[PDB]
Amino acid sequence: MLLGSHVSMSGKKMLEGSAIEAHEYGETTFMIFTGAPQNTRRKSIEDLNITKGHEVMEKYGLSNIVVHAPYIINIANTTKPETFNLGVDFLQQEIERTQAIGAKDIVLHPGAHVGAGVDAGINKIIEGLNEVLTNDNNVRIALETMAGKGTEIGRSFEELARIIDGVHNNERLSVCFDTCHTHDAGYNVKEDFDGVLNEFDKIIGVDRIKVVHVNDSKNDRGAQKDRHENIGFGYIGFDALNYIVHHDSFKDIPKILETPYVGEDKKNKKPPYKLEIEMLKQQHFDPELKNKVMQQ
Ligand SMILES: [Cl-]
Ligand SMILES: [Cl-]
Ligand SMILES: [Cl-]
Ligand SMILES: [Fe+3]
Ligand SMILES: [Fe+3]
Ligand SMILES: [Zn+2]
């Protein structure tokens, strides 16, 4: 069972600290940004502390880790060449870092068309990915299913398919399937998940899902809000999320929790991952989970 969460990548320890945190929460995989999620400033590969990080992963049985590109990348921007070029340049270096880290996939929000229209944005994403994928490496770009807020591209499987077919470099592309996003976009992952996968197989191919993000949602299906909720406390519910986590189609695919911290005061927020993972592994919902997280 490859089950983990987002973990921090910071300080002097960097990847070593990430692996320590993942083991602390009982994880067998984890996801990291290579630095701050909201900027493109990045440390050297040497400073990422990869050798020691790998040592800790070997010690604790962690594998199949995932990288997420910063949220501010927008290679769909057709008006500002500098934003497009920064995104392309950054992802080229991110591929190099990820190849050194040993992750197979970088999760990328496809982009936002910011008024040019979805199809102009898709055309620009294709252009950008063709420049990013210079063939020096095996790391894939895993396009994330998006919830559909604002001018985000990727709310539907068809949009992702149009990007993939446009790039025409299929072994360098994959999909990250986020349960909150697909639910918020309108897919019936709560009550007809196998039907959603059948549609996905027709349009993209389920074999191309290489990362799964496991999130409940604060909103009902189709609301397009992208507000994550702890497992079982939102509108998707535990029965559906547990089914997805254990689904045979996602065997050997990392499942990554991105659920919110719990707590009354922002000063006293605590991570829910250790207890959510225990709940998923035991396949039984615990209504006291949020009160227990506040007690750790
Ligand atoms: Cl698995
Ligand atoms: Cl490359
Ligand atoms: Cl719903
Ligand atoms: Fe994401
Ligand atoms: Fe996600
Ligand atoms: Zn989200």
Cα(278) to centroid of ligand 3, in Å?
25
Sorted by where each begins, the domain ranges of the chain are 1-296
CA distances, 275 to each of 259, 262, 269 (Å): 12, 12, 14
Cα(105) to centroid of ligand 5, in Å?
13
Amino acid symbol at 83: T
Asked if 1 and 212 count as a contact pair (C-beta separation under 8 A), the reply is: no
Instruction: List residues bridging with 29 in a β-sheet.
Output: 4
Residue whose C-alpha is closest to residue 113's, from 51, 155, 171: 155
User: Which residues fall in the annotated binding site for Zn(2+)?
Assistant: 68, 109, 144, 178, 181, 213, 226, 228, 258
User: Which residues fall in the annotated binding site?
Assistant: 68, 109, 144, 178, 181, 213, 226, 228, 258
Q: Which ligand is closest in space to the CA of residue 107?
A: 4
d(CA 65, CA 29): 5
Strands (E) across the chain are located at: 3-6, 29-32, 66-68, 105-108, 111-112, 140-144, 152-153, 173-178, 209-214, 216-217, 228-229, 255-257
